Amino acid sequence: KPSYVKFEVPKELAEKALQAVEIARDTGKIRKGTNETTKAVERGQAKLVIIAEDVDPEEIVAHLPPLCEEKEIPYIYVPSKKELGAAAGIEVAAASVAIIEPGKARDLVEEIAMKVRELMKLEHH
RNA sequence: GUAUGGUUAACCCGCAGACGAUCGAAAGGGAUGUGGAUGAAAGCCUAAGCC
Numbered sequence: 001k002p003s004y005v006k007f008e009v010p011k012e013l014a015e016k017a018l019q020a021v022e023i024a025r026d027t028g029k030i031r032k033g034t035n036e037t038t039k040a041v042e043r044g045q046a047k048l049v050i051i052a053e054d055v056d057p058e059e060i061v062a063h064l065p066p067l068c069e070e071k072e073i074p075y076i077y078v079p080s081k082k083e084l085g086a087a088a089g090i091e092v093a094a095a096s097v098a099i100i101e102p103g104k105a106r107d108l109v110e111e112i113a114m115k116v117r118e119l120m121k122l123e124h125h
Numbered sequence: 126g127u128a129u130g131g132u133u134a135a136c137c138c139g140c141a142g143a144c145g146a147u148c149g150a151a152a153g154g155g156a157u158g159u160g161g162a163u164g165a166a167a168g169c170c171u172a173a174g175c176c
C-alpha cells in the first residue's frame with residue numbers, strides 16, 4: 001500500500017469518481033495530467049481532484065493530498081491510472097485529474113465530497 | 126541533363142507521449158509527434174538543389 005494514500009476508498013465509491021470525470025469531460029471542464037492538476041489546485045479552481053493508487057515513484061503525486069488539504073479541496077483515490085486516463089479521454093494513462101467545472105456531474109461531485117469527508121474522519125479516528 | 130517537387134492518394138502495422146506530444150531561448154502551455162510496409166500508373170509540367 002502506498003504511503004500517500006491517507007485513507008482507503010471502497011470500490012463502488014471509486015467507480016463513481018471515474019463517472020464524474022467522464023460526465024464533466026463532456027459537460028464541463030476538467031484538467032488531465034499531474035501538471036495541469038497541480039496548477040488547478042494552487043490556483044484554487046479545482047472542484048475535485050482524483051489521484052491514482054498505482055503511481056510509482058510516489059514523488060510524482062505525493063504532494064497532492066497535502067496540497068489539497070491546505071487549499072481545502074477534496075480528493076479521492078482511484079486504483080487504476082490507465083482507467084483514469086481513459087475517463088479523461090486520452091490514449092495514455094493519467095496519474096491525476098482535476099475537475100474544474102463538473103457540469104452535469106454537479107450532483108455526483110457533491111455525493112463524492114460528502115463521502116470523502118466521512119471516510120477521512122474515520123481513518124483519523 | 127536531373128524529382129528528391131508536382132498533376133495525384135490512399136491503406137496497413139509499429140515507436141515516443143498527461144511520469145507532458147506540438148511550439149518556445151525560457152516562462153508558458155496541453156495532444157499529438159514519427160518510422161516502416163505495399164501503393165503513389167502512363168503521359169505531361171516545373172528545375173530549387175544536384176550533376
Ligand SMILES: *O[C@H]1[C@@H](O)[C@H](n2cnc3c(=O)[nH]c(N)nc32)O[C@@H]1COP(=O)(O)OP(=O)(O)OP(=O)(O)O
Pocket residue numbers: 126176
Ligand atoms: O538539354 C539541356 C542540357 O543538356 C543542357 N544543360 C544546361 N544546364 C545543365 C546542367 O546544369 N546539367 C546538365 N547535365 N545539363 C545542362 O542544356 C540543355 C537545354 O538547352 P538550353 O541551353 O537552350 O537551355 P538551358 O536553360 O539548360 O541553358 P541556357 O538556355 O542558359 O543556355
